Symmetry: D2
Subunit: 116 residues, 4 copies
């Protein structure tokens, strides 16, 4: 689909499974509106968040609930969640992958944006 999220675990060397991911879109009135959400699969990936028809240009926030993930693994972590804010631009046909690599006191995120 146009938007995928993948989450990896740097402490156990594994995909981060069953992580809640929320996508919000900035609405015309400058509030965050719920856009899509889901939980990562056993490969750490979350597919099927949205469709080409629903995913329009705008400012999006991807919120990953890293706190609940770590607690389910027996870890009480530093961050409340990991979040990523970015603009989706139509200049071409695009697909976005937001990936995050998690540790208890750190995270990395990157975006892969490709043209089909």
């Amino acid at each position: 689909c146009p938007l995928m999220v993948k989450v990896l675990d740097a402490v156990r060397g594994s995909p981060a499974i069953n992580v809640a991911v929320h996508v919000f879109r900035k609405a015309a009135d400058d509030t965050w509106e719920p856009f899509a959400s889901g939980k990562t699969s056993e490969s750490g990936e979350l597919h099927g968040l949205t469709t080409e028809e629903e995913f329009v240009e705008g400012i999006y926030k991807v919120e990953i609930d890293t706190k609940s993930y770590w607690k389910a693994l027996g870890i009480s972590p530093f961050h409340e969640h990991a979040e990523v804010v970015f603009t989706a631009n139509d200049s071409g046909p695009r697909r976005y992958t937001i990936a995050a690599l998690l540790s208890p006191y750190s995270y990395s995120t990157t975006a892969v944006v490709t043209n089909p």
Copy 2:
């Protein structure tokens, strides 16, 4: 001081200088309230955000305006900003350093928390 932010640039191999950093605290009514802010120095570090008296337990967000930083370097980047949300807990005397390593489509952040 109890809270320091440092920002590095992975494209030029340099501290990220003159980056705007905003700290917000969650208020009793669950909105973000401006708490402190500043701009990184030539070493990439932002000192003097707050004092021991002002920095209480709570939920804080550190927002780094990476978009303006990249544009001043001639780069139009992916993220709108980089932000870090975490709980400050009194269990002991603590000092927090929030560091971020920036690229145009990615960033890393980590926290260093030490007891003086």
Copy 3:
């Protein structure tokens, strides 16, 4: 296969395509011996490096030729290559993914190790 490498580009937000990857194994005499090698595909992934029969316990080094990759993109980077050294242990059936996220002056690497 038991060993996969994936390489991402943090400057362009894209898989790192056609990157040379060399795998070495430490031999009984403590030299590095060429074990397997290949180039990443259009998805940034390198499959088919080795087989279950050939991939034994040992100490492996994965060397990614990031210098040639950046130069082909018009960038003269800091590192000569990115390399990752680790032990493969038989304690169970295992599959290893070595991933790397590249910038001109920085890189991240992580390992995903799963049991089929």
Copy 4:
């Protein structure tokens, strides 16, 4: 001095203290020669590796013994060490900082290169 190394711990949110760091230089015969080495201080930093007189252009490898560091903290990690290979070039007066952020299955490294 012209070359500094700093090491941070993403699992405990702390500088990585007492970590052994080895610097090697490629000699005329294409072997690695020991150049300098030391152990990180309580701030995670290793100062005083070398002098302006000794630090010449060349190809250097910085090897961080992350395995012993994790084991002293009670963790049996994935990597044998973290290493960083790069060219030092005289085009100007330069100072190099090699920083590494460590987790049990991942690490990040970046370089900060500045002109005094």
